[PDB]
Amino acid sequence: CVNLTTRTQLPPAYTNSFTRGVYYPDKVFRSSVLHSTQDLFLPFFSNVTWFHVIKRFDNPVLPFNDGVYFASIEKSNIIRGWIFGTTLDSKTQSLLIVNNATNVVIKVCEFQFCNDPFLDMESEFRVYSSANNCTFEYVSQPFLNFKNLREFVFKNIDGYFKIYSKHTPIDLPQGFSALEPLVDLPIGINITRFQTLLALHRSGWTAGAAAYYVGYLQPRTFLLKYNENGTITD
Amino acid sequence: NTLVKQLSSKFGAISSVLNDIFSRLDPPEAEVQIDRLITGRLQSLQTY
């Protein structure tokens, strides 16, 4: 790793979310019914933080107050994985999610990173320098202007880490898109901060532009409508 | 409609259904929960 002093100070953009961040809160089927729920949701018409990555490097460290709504507008799969933790060293457990070429790997244990971790067509995978014994490991099928919109919701409650996901082909747009549950993990950690991961390749050369949005969840009461099938339409 | 919807109340019992109450507790103890549920439902129907 190297140290550089060429960064330019610029606050991230602020945008608004209209009707995004609605996910199925229970594992039960309902058809053509109006229901009321009280859970951690994303408030409607709420400001969210917008980062743009193309040079300029923007991988800050952000809190994990109660939950995270992470959205990515992108093409050619630059955003790769996620790091979650409390102190981000070998003194506390850290959760790590990386999308392989044709798989996804999730693991929770100690690790070691630089002050500005990054990822180096992929031939070399060097994000962490050391790794001690790990408690939970998991391998699964891959999760997969700008032409791809990926929405994810990360929660941690009742000693379980919940990942909800949704994908869509298309300054967020209008409309309604429910999020189906994807993974539950029995981890049980402290979790306070997190940081994203993007892929860069050395290469005239054109760099794909990507944008990602971060929003925070709060406890709220919602009234959901289920149509003839088990689809949330409003 | 409201008479139908009253059936999901607990009235202080451990559950809103009877079979799980009878399949989890011994006869000496299930009586209090059964009594609570029965009294609540009787009151609702009388009010109707």
């Binding site: 229970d26 594992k27 039960v28 089927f29 029995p186 | 919807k5 059936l7 399949s23 507790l25 011994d26």
Partner: protein, 333 residues
């Protein structure tokens, strides 16, 4: 005398509580269809899960560092949890300690530690004291069991044992199921203790020093707490019940993975999707179920029922009656 189940006139007399019935139409009772068979459906898991080493362990942890173990995806057997010792305490809250062999749970949690002899009563919902607010705290909606047994012959030693410790001084009461391992010094006074002992600077750990000689109410006790969560889930863990082939299009009583009922099971057309297990209706009752051995969806419908009325003239005139079945097409009585 009158037999209330011989003919409709007798049933009308038995309902009206009289030996004479006058002219009119009377509502007697309802008719149902009784079940004929019985089926039980449980998952095909056959392996066992660790219970021997949880109880037959060499060293249990201290109170402030209580040992936690997660139990899932097995078949639980509780018969072996009888001959632990000649006498032991076994108290279950939310369940009865005789019926937990035919119940299906989502996840099992086991917490193990060792406690002073007379503090066993303090491991209970909503109790205050020394260890229930500084060492181990339980919620007020607990659903589980607590087991405690004597450990004099194994734990106490003549030479002196000081490997068991508790905590006495803390700012605020612990959140339920929360652990603390801090050793930072207490600050009763107004000046810093600079990490050294002194007045108003007390080390927040203490020892037991068990010896074979103390009274019956002071020897160490071994305590294990089992926590369940009876909710809707894939039902990873539950006990030894034999399965049976399922029947369709016939009013039978069923036990699907712990849900008991009576009715008719039919092939379903609902558009379930991978994570959906069962379904509900307008009145918040179960309508569809998923068989945990074939991954197919079935619909539940209670078998036929209706109301019966009796039309008769006065008993003074004749003893002939007519029967009216309400709201049914009597090609399908």
């Amino acid at each position: 005398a009158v037999d209330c189940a011989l003919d409709p006139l007798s049933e009308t007399k038995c309902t009206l509580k009289s030996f004479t019935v006058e002219k009119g139409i009377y509502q007697t009772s309802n008719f149902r269809v009784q079940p004929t068979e019985s089926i039980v459906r449980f998952p095909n898991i056959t392996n066992l899960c660790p219970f021997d080493e949880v109880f037959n362990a060499t060293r249990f942890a201290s109170v402030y560092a209580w040992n936690r173990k997660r139990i899932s995806n097995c078949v639980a057997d509780y018969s072996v949890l009888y001959n632990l010792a000649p006498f032991f305490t076994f108290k279950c809250y939310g369940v009865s300690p005789t019926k937990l062999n035919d119940l299906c749970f989502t996840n099992v949690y086991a917490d193990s530690f060792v406690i002073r002899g007379d503090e066993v009563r303090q491991i209970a919902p909503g109790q205050t004291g020394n260890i229930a607010d500084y060492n181990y705290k339980l919620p007020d909606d607990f659903t589980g069991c607590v087991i405690a047994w004597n450990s004099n012959k194994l734990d106490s030693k003549v030479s002196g044992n000081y490997n068991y410790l508790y905590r006495l001084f803390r700012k605020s009461n612990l959140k339920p199921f929360e652990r603390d391992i801090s050793t930072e010094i207490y600050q009763a006074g107004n000046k810093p203790c600079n990490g050294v002992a002194g007045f108003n600077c007390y080390f927040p750990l203490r020892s037991y020093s068990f010896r074979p000689t103390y009274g019956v109410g002071h020897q160490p006790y071994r305590v294990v707490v089992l926590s369940f969560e009876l909710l809707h889930a894939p039902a990873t863990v539950c006990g030894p019940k034999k399965s049976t082939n399922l029947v369709k299009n016939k009013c039978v009583n069923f036990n699907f993975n712990g849900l008991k009922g009576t009715g008719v099971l039919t092939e379903s057309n609902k558009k379930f999707l991978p994570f959906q297990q069962f379904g509900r209706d307008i009145a918040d009752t179960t309508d569809a179920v998923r068989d945990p051995q074939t991954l197919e969806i079935l619909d539940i419908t209670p078998c036929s029922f209706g109301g019966v009325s009796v039309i008769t003239p006065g008993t003074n005139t004749s003893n002939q009656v007519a029967v009216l079945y309400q709201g049914v097409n009597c090609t399908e009585v």
